[PDB]
Amino acid sequence: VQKLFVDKIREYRTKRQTSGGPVDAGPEYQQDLDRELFKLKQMYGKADMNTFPNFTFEDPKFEAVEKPQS
Amino acid sequence: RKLALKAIDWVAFGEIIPRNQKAIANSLKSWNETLSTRLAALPEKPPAI
């Protein structure tokens, strides 16, 4: 069916004329890609784009031992 | 690999014999065991970027 071989490539080239993502999204693709974009961040964490690690650690304080001896 | 060795000091080190200060050494070796291998996995270097 090479007449069908040409007819699924030629209506693939029409999909390669794109402006803003989906062609017939409407309220469908706008809600779904925003529902999924939250879920990759919801149970994952709150993370910005480029912020480095900012913290500070304190070690164990070295106490002394009192000892009258001999 | 910044890491220090030591001597074999487990036998009489709990026998420090303070004024009934048995807990002073019996807690001392207890900190000594966990801190040894845990700081060994710190001391050498960080992995590849």
């Binding site: 007819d7 699924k8 209506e11 017939d24 974009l37 | -």
Partner: protein, 52 residues
């Protein structure tokens, strides 16, 4: 993990657009079907020839 998930949501929509549009394009034709029948005869004419 955001780069990969937006590729997956885009990939399935791109497939169904080519698929749901070809249903009406194959249905509308009326002259090329007569072209399609004579080659369907010639394939069957070719098919029985290699058997016997």
């Amino acid at each position: 993990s955001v780069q990969n998930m937006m590729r997956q949501k885009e990939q399935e929509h791109m497939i169904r657009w080519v698929e749901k549009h070809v249903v009406q394009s194959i249905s509308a034709q009326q002259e090329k079907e007569t072209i399609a029948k004579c080659i369907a005869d010639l394939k069957l004419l070719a098919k029985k020839a290699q058997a016997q």
